[PDB]
Design an enzyme around this catalytic site. Structure first.
Site, mmCIF file in Angstrom:
data_model
loop_
_atom_site.group_PDB
_atom_site.id
_atom_site.type_symbol
_atom_site.label_atom_id
_atom_site.label_comp_id
_atom_site.label_asym_id
_atom_site.label_seq_id
_atom_site.Cartn_x
_atom_site.Cartn_y
_atom_site.Cartn_z
ATOM 1 N N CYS A 62 15.842 45.703 14.162
ATOM 2 C CA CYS A 62 16.668 45.723 14.986
ATOM 3 C C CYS A 62 16.982 46.764 15.954
ATOM 4 O O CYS A 62 16.072 47.861 16.027
ATOM 5 C CB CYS A 62 18.258 46.178 13.696
ATOM 6 S SG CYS A 62 19.240 47.500 13.722
ATOM 7 N N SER A 79 18.630 49.562 16.125
ATOM 8 C CA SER A 79 18.270 51.030 15.340
ATOM 9 C C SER A 79 17.381 51.484 14.902
ATOM 10 O O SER A 79 17.033 52.555 14.773
ATOM 11 C CB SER A 79 19.359 50.791 13.936
ATOM 12 O OG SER A 79 20.664 50.695 14.953
ATOM 13 N N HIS A 123 15.211 52.529 17.643
ATOM 14 C CA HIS A 123 16.156 53.906 18.411
ATOM 15 C C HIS A 123 15.621 55.369 17.441
ATOM 16 O O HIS A 123 15.669 56.110 18.402
ATOM 17 C CB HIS A 123 17.765 54.317 17.715
ATOM 18 C CG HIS A 123 18.795 53.192 18.646
ATOM 19 N ND1 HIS A 123 18.471 53.209 19.977
ATOM 20 C CD2 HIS A 123 20.125 53.017 18.179
ATOM 21 C CE1 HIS A 123 19.727 52.938 20.677
ATOM 22 N NE2 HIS A 123 20.435 52.018 19.247
ATOM 23 N N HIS A 127 15.593 48.915 7.908
ATOM 24 C CA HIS A 127 16.534 48.420 6.977
ATOM 25 C C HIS A 127 17.545 47.063 6.897
ATOM 26 O O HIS A 127 18.544 47.319 6.063
ATOM 27 C CB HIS A 127 17.778 49.092 8.067
ATOM 28 C CG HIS A 127 17.980 48.888 9.143
ATOM 29 N ND1 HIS A 127 17.582 48.785 10.599
ATOM 30 C CD2 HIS A 127 19.266 48.194 10.028
ATOM 31 C CE1 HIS A 127 17.590 49.192 11.487
ATOM 32 N NE2 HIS A 127 19.752 48.564 10.572
ATOM 33 N N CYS A 140 22.428 43.923 8.156
ATOM 34 C CA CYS A 140 22.765 44.576 8.804
ATOM 35 C C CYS A 140 23.218 43.511 9.992
ATOM 36 O O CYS A 140 24.337 44.379 9.888
ATOM 37 C CB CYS A 140 21.228 45.080 9.334
ATOM 38 S SG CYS A 140 21.697 47.045 10.676
HETATM 39 N N1 LIG Z 1 27.493 50.872 13.657
HETATM 40 C C1 LIG Z 1 26.493 50.325 12.561
HETATM 41 O O1 LIG Z 1 26.227 49.956 11.630
HETATM 42 C C2 LIG Z 1 25.214 49.473 13.747
HETATM 43 C C3 LIG Z 1 24.349 48.454 13.207
HETATM 44 C C4 LIG Z 1 23.519 47.495 13.391
HETATM 45 C C5 LIG Z 1 22.927 48.381 14.693
HETATM 46 N N2 LIG Z 1 23.639 49.252 15.606
HETATM 47 C C6 LIG Z 1 24.016 49.802 16.817
HETATM 48 O O2 LIG Z 1 24.082 48.911 17.691
HETATM 49 C C7 LIG Z 1 23.651 48.108 18.912
HETATM 50 C C8 LIG Z 1 23.045 47.398 19.869
HETATM 51 O O3 LIG Z 1 21.983 46.495 18.495
HETATM 52 P P1 LIG Z 1 21.518 45.423 18.835
HETATM 53 O O4 LIG Z 1 20.118 45.390 17.962
HETATM 54 O O5 LIG Z 1 22.853 44.177 19.109
HETATM 55 O O6 LIG Z 1 20.781 45.647 20.581
HETATM 56 P P2 LIG Z 1 20.039 44.984 21.402
HETATM 57 O O7 LIG Z 1 19.042 46.248 21.727
HETATM 58 O O8 LIG Z 1 19.343 43.522 20.678
HETATM 59 O O9 LIG Z 1 21.373 44.494 22.513
HETATM 60 C C9 LIG Z 1 22.052 45.659 23.213
HETATM 61 C C10 LIG Z 1 22.318 44.946 24.631
HETATM 62 O O10 LIG Z 1 23.147 45.387 25.313
HETATM 63 C C11 LIG Z 1 22.712 45.514 26.456
HETATM 64 N N3 LIG Z 1 22.676 46.300 27.652
HETATM 65 C C12 LIG Z 1 21.849 47.228 27.815
HETATM 66 N N4 LIG Z 1 22.450 48.365 28.479
HETATM 67 C C13 LIG Z 1 23.691 47.554 28.683
HETATM 68 C C14 LIG Z 1 24.401 48.155 29.582
HETATM 69 N N5 LIG Z 1 24.643 49.735 30.555
HETATM 70 N N6 LIG Z 1 26.046 47.197 30.298
HETATM 71 C C15 LIG Z 1 26.060 46.316 29.225
HETATM 72 N N7 LIG Z 1 24.643 46.262 28.903
HETATM 73 C C16 LIG Z 1 23.850 46.943 28.451
HETATM 74 C C17 LIG Z 1 21.664 45.209 26.633
HETATM 75 O O11 LIG Z 1 20.667 44.063 27.942
HETATM 76 C C18 LIG Z 1 21.262 43.596 24.768
HETATM 77 O O12 LIG Z 1 21.535 42.941 25.553
HETATM 78 C C19 LIG Z 1 22.604 48.767 19.396
HETATM 79 O O13 LIG Z 1 23.032 51.299 19.405
HETATM 80 C C20 LIG Z 1 22.199 49.232 17.363
HETATM 81 O O14 LIG Z 1 21.345 50.650 17.190
HETATM 82 C C21 LIG Z 1 24.816 50.108 14.889
HETATM 83 C C1 LIG Z 2 25.904 58.180 11.009
HETATM 84 C C2 LIG Z 2 25.200 57.450 11.423
HETATM 85 C C3 LIG Z 2 23.606 56.586 11.571
HETATM 86 C C4 LIG Z 2 24.127 55.409 12.111
HETATM 87 C C5 LIG Z 2 22.672 54.729 11.985
HETATM 88 C C6 LIG Z 2 22.524 53.287 11.376
HETATM 89 C C7 LIG Z 2 21.580 52.599 11.410
HETATM 90 C C8 LIG Z 2 20.202 52.891 10.919
HETATM 91 N N1 LIG Z 2 22.208 51.630 10.878
HETATM 92 C C9 LIG Z 2 21.908 49.680 11.013
HETATM 93 O O1 LIG Z 2 21.647 49.712 12.201
HETATM 94 ZN ZN LIG Z 3 20.360 47.564 11.728
#
Ligand SMILES: NC(=O)c1ccc[n+]([C@@H]2O[C@H](COP(=O)([O-])OP(=O)(O)OC[C@H]3O[C@@H](n4cnc5c(N)ncnc54)[C@H](O)[C@@H]3O)[C@@H](O)[C@H]2O)c1
Ligand SMILES: CCCCCC[C@@H](C)NC=O
Ligand SMILES: [Zn+2]
Ligand SMILES: NC(=O)c1ccc[n+]([C@@H]2O[C@H](COP(=O)([O-])OP(=O)(O)OC[C@H]3O[C@@H](n4cnc5c(N)ncnc54)[C@H](O)[C@@H]3O)[C@@H](O)[C@H]2O)c1
Ligand SMILES: CCCCCC[C@@H](C)NC=O
Ligand SMILES: [Zn+2]
Ligand SMILES: [Zn+2]
Ligand SMILES: [Zn+2]
Lengths: 374, 374
Positions: free
Chosen positions: B46, B48, B51, B67, B174
């Protein structure tokens, strides 16, 4: 008869920022197609009117302010079907055209016909119906109720119960509906929850009433003016706190009182500091913060988006989220059934001629709602 | 058997920011009374996890990340009642203790036992189960799934269908659940609405799926990498746009495409500029904007509260707002009942030992989800 004719009447005109209203004689043109001319019976004084006087809310001057009012239809133009001469009515600062994207969407109420966003100070056809000795006078949010007569669009007037006491129900034109609706319709306060309400003016107290109607377990009323606390408790607040009493920021105070933060917080003041505190005081996992107060034009908050990621909701609305024309008659019908009462919000009643006195009462913190009788 | 004994196995350890993982021999302590030791079968990569490597998401190092995973229970502590040795399971990076204020609230899921905000890198008793050459290593979000064995709190593991294909359903731990839920549960996308999704990685595509399942009429997929567009169309997007193709900012382009703005916008990237654009592209009177992406640790948005006052809703959530332990088995059951498929999200499959190649694929833009096999 005045029908079809230009009426010369008394109005409160604001010529300059930060100055008293001037009682002038003004000329009020008759209503065009789909317009309604109204003889005012009662008008309330709201902080939003004072925001214009202070220069916090920009709208074109010179202007006749006033937007929380009730009156009786003197006459209607061609095409008007929803109101007629003699009906009791409330003018709607947020119109309900019933035809635009927003009016068709069941969850929204900010009609595209509003004059709130980018104010022109006219009616919906783009012209003004007021002159003061040949000089033109702007409208305010389409309604301009601080005048013995005003002209408004049909979609900005609601027909209400013929037996309605206008000196009380004018509040449904703004303050009460906004506050009550912000709790029951925008936040959708859940029963059993904890609420924080920042600001205990007419609108803040109506938010207190709405949280009480919604069944909240705890309603924490926050005001720097402790004279506001007795009425807040009367209307359902369970605790009252004054931020000036504390060394800690009020959001920390509220979090420590509420096992990590309230379920629903409301900013009903219009200040950036308290909007931030209101957001931060709702629980990071389950909190909802509603902006009701109108901030000074174009001033920004610094927001860490991590505040929302954990599960908070931040939202705002105009007029309690009520679709104006369909909601106002229902709320007046609720009032007539004594579902809620408005007397506690009306602290002072003055003749229209004493508008400036009514504003000084507001600025002094001493009044909730002053109602002006015409 | 291994029950009650320290297990020696391999794990991917991050010893320093911006450096490759190292496959290390580690010792995994037996589970304490309400803990569960799991043998990993499949783990997804992922954004994340990346990150943390890049320093965008702060967590104590040294650490074992991962995760998004599925595995088979090796052993349980004596107080465990909800899983048994041999059960298939998905570890929960958001726990469900079932006792706290948030777990008891039907609308919220960010359980107070989480190690997400302000991470300690421990299990819930504040200690750690991993050592490498006898020195402690941190856990990640309670779960640490990039290891052949991990130990997790019982409230952070769900039992799933014994028949389920673990190399696919690990995504429910996730990416898929987060995106899907963000649409159906957090935003509550309505039939016939218009949606904009910023970012078309595994999480954003799962938001596309959720909007389609909710019956949106239009789903506008936004990505700066046009190679992401064909999969987005496959999964339901109606239109795909690249902000770099336009002369104006993407929020203005989207507003002009959608009669003033979308009903629901989603930021699924983790960048402040796109969080702003996503907020601004939903309609000022009826729009809802959801933050899904994890923002970088030290940055603010500059927000005029008037953006919300007209009727917008802005919110965020973790894990699609799903209460994790009750939801994960139901989503696996939906998968087994053929309600949705995960194959489109899985673009690469690699052995655990090739974790760094899997991260290189993610960083180069080439993959959606790489699933590691153990
Ligand atoms: N809130 C949550 O519970 C949760 C859980 C999982 C992941 N996340 C988060 O969600 C986000 C996405 O995760 P993912 O695994 O799908 O990432 P990913 O990197 O596979 O995909 C992100 C996409 O965004 C695009 N992108 C990057 N910059 C851009 C921009 N300026 N404009 C338009 N598109 C852009 C990329 O080309 C890519 O296709 C991450 O920040 C991740 O940490 C949050
Ligand atoms: C409180 C914000 C922390 C969010 C990070 C969640 C992340 C580890 N989970 C899935 O991608
Ligand atoms: Zn995740
Ligand atoms: N969104 C809408 O549709 C809508 C409609 C009507 C009014 N409003 C706005 O709602 C707000 C309230 O209107 P009102 O008529 O009730 O105003 P009001 O002036 O009668 O009341 C405001 C209250 O806030 C208190 N206050 C001021 N500064 C404070 C601070 N720093 N901390 C704590 N308390 C503070 C005052 O003591 C007062 O009791 C105004 O900004 C008004 O423009 C919005
Ligand atoms: C959208 C900005 C307008 C908010 C001020 C509205 C005010 C005039 N209405 C009621 O008090
Ligand atoms: Zn309309
Ligand atoms: Zn008002
Ligand atoms: Zn919990």
């Amino acid at each position: 008869s005045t029908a079809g004719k230009v009426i010369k009447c008394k109005a409160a005109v604001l010529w300059e920022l930060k100055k008293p209203f001037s009682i002038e004689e003004v000329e009020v043109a008759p209503p065009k197609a789909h317009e309604v001319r109204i003889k005012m019976v009662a008008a309330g004084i709201c902080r939003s009117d004072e925001h214009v006087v202070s220069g916090n809310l920009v709208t074109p001057l010179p202007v006749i302010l006033g937007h929380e009012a009730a009156g009786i239809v003197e006459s209607v133009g061609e095409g008007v079907t929803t109101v007629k001469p003699g009906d009791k009515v409330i003018p709607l600062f947020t119109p309900q055209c019933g035809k635009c994207r927003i009016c068709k969407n069941p969850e929204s109420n900010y009609c595209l016909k509003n004059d709130l966003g980018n104010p022109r100070g006219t009616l919906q056809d783009g012209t003004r119906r007021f002159t003061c000795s040949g000089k033109p006078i702007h409208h305010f949010v389409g309604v301009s109720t601080f005048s013995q007569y005003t002209v408004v669009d049909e979609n900005a007037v609601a027909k209400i119960d013929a037996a309605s006491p206008l000196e009380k129900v004018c509040l449904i034109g703004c303050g009460f509906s906004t506050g009550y609706g912000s709790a029951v319709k925008v936040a959708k306060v859940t029963p059993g929850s904890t609420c924080a309400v920042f600001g205990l003016g007419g609108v803040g107290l109506s938010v207190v009433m709405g949280c009480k109607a919604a069944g909240a377990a705890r309603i924490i009323a926050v005001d720097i003016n402790k004279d506001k606390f007795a009425k807040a408790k009367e209307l359902g607040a369970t605790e009252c706190i004054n931020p000036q009493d504390y060394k800690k920021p009020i959001q920390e105070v509220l979090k420590e009182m509420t096992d990590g933060g309230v379920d629903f917080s409301f900013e009903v003041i219009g200040q950036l500091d308290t909007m931030m505190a209101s957001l931060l005081c709702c629980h990071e996992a389950c909190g909802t913060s509603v902006i009701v107060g109108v901030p000074p034009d174009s001033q920004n908050l610094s927001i860490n988006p991590m505040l929302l990621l954990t599960g908070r909701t931040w939202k705002g609305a105009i007029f309690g989220g009520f679709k104006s024309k369909e909601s106002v008659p229902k709320l007046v019908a609720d009032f007539m059934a004594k579902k809620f009462s408005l007397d506690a919000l009306i602290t002072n009643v003055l003749p229209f001629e004493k508008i400036n006195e009514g504003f000084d009462l507001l600025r002094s913190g001493k009044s909730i709602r002053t109602v002006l009788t015409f």
